[PDB]
Design a protein around this ligand. Structure first.
Ligand SMILES: CCCSCc1cc(N)cc2c(=O)[nH]c(N)nc12
Ligand SMILES: CCCSCc1cc(N)cc2c(=O)[nH]c(N)nc12
Ligand SMILES: [Zn+2]
Ligand SMILES: [Zn+2]
Lengths: 372, 372
């Protein structure tokens, strides 16, 4: 396969379905990417992640640069070899989790300095260092290093962050291109900023397209603005991005958010919702999510979801999983997580099929009627 | 297959190798039984437990009578159906864990009254109730309810507990036989007591054989007496039990203890060592155990053990598992546990093969030279 090739096979309104071909594999879009925090998709072997239908997973750069270390992972053969996943891996820049999880973050035009929330050590992440770390990890899809804008944001602060992000996008692009091996085997995605302001989103889109990237992410959303506002921003933002390149909505995962985002032109998603769901006891079903810990499931012999085809729903009952979760058993987490990721992959498959068959709008309507 | 049939195919000294045929499957002996605490073998799907080579697993009655409940499990279809393991399951009586894990234990000739270490509720376990609970669980091999003797024990206290245990063995036998379904589909094992005293062990053996059981366990060992003392007690104790029935050493699992016990006539083992090993970071190898958390494994690309054939050793490095365990990741526990149980099953296979080939003594010698 080529380094990168996105082809749209079908459309319906703003929705698209197709494939991204990369050296390590083919990614069917719209795609949902399970999140692998510390070089592991929580409670699942890579083979199980693949069995659910996942074509690609996401790796958290922040955690990886801290815990095992980027250089160490490189010496060990790369992230793919290290964790046992041989298909594409998209890695975030690490900047977002720096502003969220680390201590004493000192920001500047050069980048960000911070203290680890683990050992209390210090690191200086920048557009160049972030790109380098993702290269050391052996990432297939590299995210440009940006500055995420907090919600709510004033027009002037949103403009300043967006402008810095665009300067950092150019630096990321140049850093990526100067590294022959990375430029030839991996892809680079740019990230649109601008908060909820249309003029800023437009300026960001133009700057990103001017530089040129393999894909474009809509950043700055799912930060506390609510679904209505998120959808409203997507309404005018997605059309600004190049039509022939993938559109990635970062950190968006509720089933209904995904359906609405695809209706607005989004091709890629990622979220910790599926994995963290089977941590507090939340299991997704076509009739809405359920909390398996509730007493009403103690003697329920039915599977998590009545039509889900995952191994968990074929072999175990709600009653058993209810017991496991309440007992704090590891198998409870393993089973809940496998089901949830499988449910998400089945959702993406139903979305892809409906678009290909020109009945996506009907699918969205039916999905919502039953889910709510 | 029959309800129960133990046949010895080969011998070498006191060591034996053969099979126990039961309705749910064949058990190759000497056998190692992974421990399933709360209806789950810690961090492993039943299919993975089977993949390691396990023919039978053990279920903890104490935990089960508390957490989900014996009656509830029966209403749900039995333990096999509940957890997804369709092969034989041996269940302990629950009495041992009552004296270890529960609060305010009031003992008498009728049985034991106690408070749950969970909800703080109260239960009255007796020979009859224990047998009934194991029936409700759908156990294949039922353990007689006894009174474990604390170490060290005086001759008079050891005699009193052993005598009570023998009276309780008769009650267990009668309770088992009066329940047609259980007597016809399951087996009952008696437990020898008597601490470290030969005369008591002899009296216990005679009483047990007089009643008659499908198998005989050597109880009261692995309670703090040390390997030397344990072996010394086994030297004179195992020969006292009926030769044509299985000999089960309860709660014994260190690899070297197993090898020495088989040399003394033991056919069955169980222990939490394998599962708890991959909790603190201990991994078994033919060159002795290693603690994967140690810094020397941070960049070690070799598998846990150089010759182990488990899926873990085929796919992941010590470096990766080291990272997972130190990160507190669930996959770390899953991988360590699978390897350890697989290592134990491979040990049992090497033991069975060496006995069948008349070279077990040489195997024990070679095993120890390299393991220590
Ligand atoms: C688990 C982390 C992967 S997605 C993180 C994420 C989530 C959301 N909602 C927005 C952003 C953003 O604007 N920039 C970056 N780098 N990341 C974002
Ligand atoms: C996880 C518990 C299964 S084995 C428990 C055990 C372990 C040891 N070492 C001795 C005994 C005993 O004498 N009686 C009983 N019921 N159980 C014993
Ligand atoms: Zn399912
Ligand atoms: Zn192994």
């Amino acid at each position: 396969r080529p380094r990168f090739s996105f082809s749209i096979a079908a459309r319906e309104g703003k929705a698209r379905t197709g494939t991204i071909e990369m050296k390590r594999g083919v990614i069917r879009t719209p795609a949902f990417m399970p999140v692998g925090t510390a070089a592991t998709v929580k409670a699942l072997k890579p083979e199980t992640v693949r069995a659910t239908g996942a074509d690609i997973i996401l790796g958290n750069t922040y955690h990886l640069m801290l815990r095992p270390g980027a250089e160490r992972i490189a010496k060990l053969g790369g992230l793919h070899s290290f964790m046992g996943w041989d298909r594409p891996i998209l890695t975030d820049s690490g900047g977002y989790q720096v502003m969220s999880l680390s201590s004493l973050t000192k920001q500047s035009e050069e980048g960000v300095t911070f203290k680890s929330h683990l050992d209390g050590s210090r690191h200086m992440l920048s557009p160049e260092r972030s790109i380098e770390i993702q290269h050391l990890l052996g990432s297939d899809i590299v995210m440009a290093f940006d500055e995420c804008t907090p919600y709510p944001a004033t027009p002037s602060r949103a403009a300043s962050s967006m402008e810095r992000s665009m300067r950092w996008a150019k630096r990321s692009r140049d850093a990526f291109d100067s590294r022959k091996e990375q430029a030839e085997n991996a892809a680079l995605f740019g990230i649109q900023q601008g908060s909820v302001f249309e003029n800023l989103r437009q300026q960001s889109a133009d700057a990103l397209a001017e530089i040129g990237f393999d894909g474009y992410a809509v950043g700055g959303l799912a930060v506390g603005e609510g679904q209505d506002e998120m959808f409203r921003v997507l309404d005018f933002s997605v059309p600004m991005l190049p039509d022939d390149k993938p559109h990635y909505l970062m950190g968006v995962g509720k089933p209904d958010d995904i359906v609405g985002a695809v209706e607005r032109g989004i091709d890629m998603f990622d979220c910790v919702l599926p994995t963290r769901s089977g941590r507090n006891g939340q299991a997704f079903t076509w009739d809405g999510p359920i909390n398996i810990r509730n007493a009403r499931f103690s003697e329920d012999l039915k599977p998590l979801d009545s039509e889900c085809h995952c191994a968990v729903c074929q072999k175990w009952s709600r009653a058993y999983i209810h017991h496991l979760i309440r007992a704090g058993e590891i198998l409870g987490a393993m089973l809940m997580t496998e089901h949830n990721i499988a449910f998400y992959q089945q959702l993406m498959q139903k979305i892809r099929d409906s678009i290909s068959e020109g009945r996506f709008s009907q699918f969205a309507q039916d999905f919502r009627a039953r889910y709510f």
